[PDB]
Short mmCIF file of C-alpha atoms and ligand atoms in Angstrom, two decimals:
data_model
loop_
_atom_site.label_atom_id
_atom_site.label_comp_id
_atom_site.label_asym_id
_atom_site.label_seq_id
_atom_site.Cartn_x
_atom_site.Cartn_y
_atom_site.Cartn_z
CA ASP A 1243 -136.27 -172.27 132.61
CA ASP A 1244 -135.14 -172.90 129.06
CA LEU A 1245 -131.37 -173.07 128.76
CA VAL A 1246 -129.12 -171.42 126.18
CA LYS A 1247 -126.21 -173.34 124.65
CA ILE A 1248 -122.98 -171.40 124.13
CA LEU A 1249 -119.84 -173.10 122.79
CA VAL A 1250 -116.17 -172.18 123.19
CA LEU A 1251 -113.75 -172.74 120.27
CA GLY A 1252 -110.40 -171.40 119.10
CA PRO A 1253 -106.72 -172.29 118.87
CA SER A 1254 -105.32 -174.63 121.47
CA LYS A 1255 -103.30 -173.08 124.32
CA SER A 1256 -105.25 -169.87 123.66
CA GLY A 1257 -107.05 -169.77 126.99
CA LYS A 1258 -110.57 -171.00 126.34
CA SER A 1259 -111.21 -172.63 129.73
CA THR A 1260 -109.71 -169.97 131.99
CA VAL A 1261 -112.53 -167.90 130.50
CA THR A 1262 -115.15 -170.64 131.01
CA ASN A 1263 -114.45 -171.02 134.73
CA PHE A 1264 -114.18 -167.27 135.25
CA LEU A 1265 -117.42 -166.80 133.31
CA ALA A 1266 -119.36 -169.80 134.64
CA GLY A 1267 -118.23 -168.98 138.19
CA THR A 1268 -115.48 -171.45 139.06
CA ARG A 1269 -113.24 -169.10 140.93
CA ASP A 1270 -109.91 -167.49 140.09
CA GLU A 1271 -103.29 -180.82 129.61
CA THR A 1272 -106.36 -179.55 127.76
CA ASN A 1273 -109.33 -181.91 127.82
CA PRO A 1274 -111.61 -182.81 124.89
CA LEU A 1275 -114.75 -181.20 126.33
CA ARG A 1276 -116.22 -179.74 129.47
CA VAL A 1277 -119.66 -178.32 130.10
CA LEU A 1278 -120.09 -175.58 132.67
CA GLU A 1279 -123.48 -174.34 133.79
CA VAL A 1280 -124.03 -170.76 134.93
CA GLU A 1281 -127.47 -169.29 135.50
CA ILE A 1282 -127.67 -165.62 134.59
CA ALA A 1283 -131.10 -164.04 134.49
CA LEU A 1284 -133.02 -160.81 135.00
CA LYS A 1285 -134.81 -168.49 134.93
CA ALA A 1286 -131.97 -168.37 132.40
CA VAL A 1287 -129.49 -171.20 132.83
CA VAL A 1288 -126.52 -170.72 130.53
CA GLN A 1289 -124.26 -173.56 129.47
CA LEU A 1290 -120.65 -172.90 128.54
CA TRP A 1291 -119.28 -175.77 126.44
CA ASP A 1292 -115.47 -175.63 126.50
CA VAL A 1293 -114.06 -177.56 123.52
CA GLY A 1294 -110.54 -178.86 122.95
CA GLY A 1295 -109.08 -179.17 119.48
CA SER A 1296 -108.38 -182.31 117.50
CA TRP A 1297 -117.86 -184.42 116.06
CA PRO A 1298 -120.44 -182.15 114.38
CA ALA A 1299 -123.06 -183.69 116.65
CA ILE A 1300 -122.07 -181.20 119.38
CA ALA A 1301 -123.74 -178.17 117.74
CA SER A 1302 -127.21 -179.53 118.62
CA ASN A 1303 -129.54 -176.51 118.70
CA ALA A 1304 -126.54 -174.37 119.59
CA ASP A 1305 -127.35 -170.74 120.25
CA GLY A 1306 -124.07 -168.79 120.51
CA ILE A 1307 -120.29 -169.10 120.23
CA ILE A 1308 -117.26 -167.49 121.89
CA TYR A 1309 -113.94 -167.74 120.04
CA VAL A 1310 -110.60 -167.36 121.86
CA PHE A 1311 -107.11 -166.99 120.36
CA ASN A 1312 -103.72 -165.74 121.46
CA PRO A 1313 -102.89 -162.59 119.48
CA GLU A 1314 -99.16 -162.98 120.13
CA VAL A 1315 -99.35 -166.35 118.32
CA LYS A 1316 -99.56 -166.65 114.54
CA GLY A 1317 -102.23 -168.54 112.66
CA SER A 1318 -104.42 -167.99 115.72
CA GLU A 1319 -106.46 -165.43 113.77
CA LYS A 1320 -106.60 -167.96 110.94
CA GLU A 1321 -107.17 -171.25 112.77
CA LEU A 1322 -110.51 -169.85 113.99
CA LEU A 1323 -111.86 -170.17 110.45
CA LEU A 1324 -111.76 -173.94 110.84
CA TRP A 1325 -113.77 -173.48 114.03
CA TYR A 1326 -115.91 -171.09 112.01
CA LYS A 1327 -116.12 -173.73 109.28
CA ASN A 1328 -116.53 -176.89 111.33
CA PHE A 1329 -119.35 -175.46 113.42
CA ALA A 1330 -121.12 -172.37 112.03
CA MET A 1331 -124.73 -175.79 107.84
CA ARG A 1332 -124.70 -172.25 109.37
CA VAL A 1333 -125.63 -173.37 112.88
CA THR A 1334 -124.83 -170.07 114.59
CA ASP A 1335 -125.48 -166.53 113.40
CA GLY A 1336 -124.07 -163.32 114.78
CA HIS A 1337 -124.68 -164.12 118.45
CA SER A 1338 -120.93 -164.68 118.71
CA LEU A 1339 -117.81 -163.19 120.32
CA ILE A 1340 -114.08 -163.18 119.58
CA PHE A 1341 -111.37 -162.65 122.23
CA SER A 1342 -107.86 -161.36 121.61
CA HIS A 1343 -106.68 -162.96 124.84
CA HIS A 1344 -103.52 -162.13 126.81
CA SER A 1345 -102.07 -165.17 128.57
CA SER A 1346 -98.63 -163.50 128.38
CA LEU A 1347 -97.04 -160.08 128.48
CA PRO A 1348 -98.30 -158.57 125.19
CA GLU A 1349 -95.47 -158.05 122.73
CA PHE A 1350 -97.21 -158.20 119.37
CA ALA A 1351 -100.81 -157.70 120.51
CA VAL A 1352 -100.05 -154.23 121.92
CA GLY A 1353 -100.92 -151.17 119.91
CA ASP A 1354 -103.25 -150.07 117.14
CA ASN A 1355 -104.83 -153.51 117.01
CA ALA A 1356 -104.57 -155.16 120.41
CA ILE A 1357 -107.28 -157.09 118.72
CA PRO A 1358 -105.21 -157.90 115.62
CA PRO A 1359 -106.71 -157.69 112.13
CA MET A 1360 -109.35 -160.37 111.62
CA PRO A 1361 -110.16 -162.51 108.57
CA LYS A 1362 -113.07 -161.41 106.41
CA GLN A 1363 -115.64 -163.95 107.63
CA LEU A 1364 -114.94 -162.93 111.25
CA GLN A 1365 -114.55 -159.16 110.77
CA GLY A 1366 -118.28 -158.88 111.47
CA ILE A 1367 -118.33 -160.32 115.02
CA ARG A 1368 -117.69 -158.10 118.06
CA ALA A 1369 -114.12 -158.47 119.32
CA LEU A 1370 -112.33 -157.58 122.55
CA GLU A 1371 -108.90 -157.50 124.10
CA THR A 1372 -108.98 -159.84 127.04
CA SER A 1373 -106.96 -160.82 130.09
CA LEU A 1374 -107.37 -161.52 133.78
CA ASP A 1375 -104.16 -159.73 134.78
CA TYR A 1376 -102.95 -157.77 131.76
CA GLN A 1377 -104.88 -155.00 130.02
CA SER A 1378 -108.53 -155.89 129.88
CA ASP A 1379 -112.07 -154.88 128.98
CA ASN A 1380 -115.12 -155.58 131.17
CA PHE A 1381 -115.98 -158.71 129.24
CA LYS A 1382 -118.23 -160.13 131.94
CA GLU A 1383 -120.62 -157.46 130.61
CA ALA A 1384 -120.27 -158.52 126.96
CA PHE A 1385 -120.99 -162.08 128.02
CA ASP A 1386 -123.96 -160.98 130.13
CA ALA A 1387 -125.26 -159.11 127.07
CA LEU A 1388 -124.80 -162.08 124.72
CA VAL A 1389 -127.30 -164.31 126.55
CA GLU A 1390 -130.03 -161.66 126.33
CA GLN A 1391 -129.68 -161.30 122.57
CA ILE A 1392 -129.80 -165.08 122.17
CA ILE A 1393 -133.05 -165.59 124.07
CA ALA A 1394 -134.39 -162.27 122.78
CA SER A 1395 -136.08 -163.67 119.68
CA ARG A 1396 -136.59 -167.36 120.37
CA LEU A 1397 -140.06 -165.84 120.79
N1 GTP B 900 -101.11 -164.56 132.69
C1 GTP B 900 -102.17 -165.16 132.15
N2 GTP B 900 -102.11 -166.50 131.83
C2 GTP B 900 -103.19 -167.12 131.28
C3 GTP B 900 -104.36 -166.42 131.02
N3 GTP B 900 -105.25 -167.28 130.48
C4 GTP B 900 -104.66 -168.49 130.38
N4 GTP B 900 -103.39 -168.40 130.88
C5 GTP B 900 -102.40 -169.47 130.99
O1 GTP B 900 -102.43 -170.19 129.78
C6 GTP B 900 -103.09 -171.43 129.96
C7 GTP B 900 -104.23 -171.48 128.95
O2 GTP B 900 -104.81 -172.76 129.00
P1 GTP B 900 -106.32 -172.95 128.55
O3 GTP B 900 -107.14 -171.89 129.23
O4 GTP B 900 -106.86 -174.31 128.89
O5 GTP B 900 -106.22 -172.73 126.98
P2 GTP B 900 -106.91 -173.78 125.99
O6 GTP B 900 -106.55 -173.46 124.56
O7 GTP B 900 -108.39 -173.68 126.23
O8 GTP B 900 -106.33 -175.23 126.39
C8 GTP B 900 -103.63 -171.47 131.39
O9 GTP B 900 -103.35 -172.69 132.04
C9 GTP B 900 -102.93 -170.35 132.12
O10 GTP B 900 -101.90 -170.84 132.95
C10 GTP B 900 -104.43 -165.07 131.33
O11 GTP B 900 -105.47 -164.45 131.10
N5 GTP B 900 -103.33 -164.45 131.89
MG1 MG B 901 -108.72 -176.67 128.19
#
């Protein structure tokens, strides 16, 4: 029943924990750190680690990362490179996600990139437009699929 460790980084006020609870199961002012535990299998117990911005001892044998940023907000696309820098040494490789996340009515995000243009280091990681109420992709599926690719080659 070997667990998989997935972290959650990104700009503050971006939405990281509304995703964690929705993903980890918790139904429906930011804290340093939470850990949520969701088991998703096909015993695969998955651990969402919701981080709050300002401790490189937290990437211990980390397996995957999910970045969240508000597209309507500037520097959000660019703050994530500090998360990229501070954590992925190169701890994490490719088993990552990036969320253009609507917490608001999309004014800028809308259009030809409702996932706005990404920096070069991050242009390689799969990206989605994301919301619980506004326009959305089935990102429960992309999360489901991330755990399989993580465990896929640990053996
Ligand atoms: N309408 C809407 N509001 C959201 C959504 N996600 C987050 N919010 C609001 O924005 C806040 C985001 O806070 P967090 O999820 O903790 O973001 P953080 O950067 O992790 O801190 C939440 O308290 C919500 O009230 C969303 O998908 N839709
Ligand atoms: Mg929070």
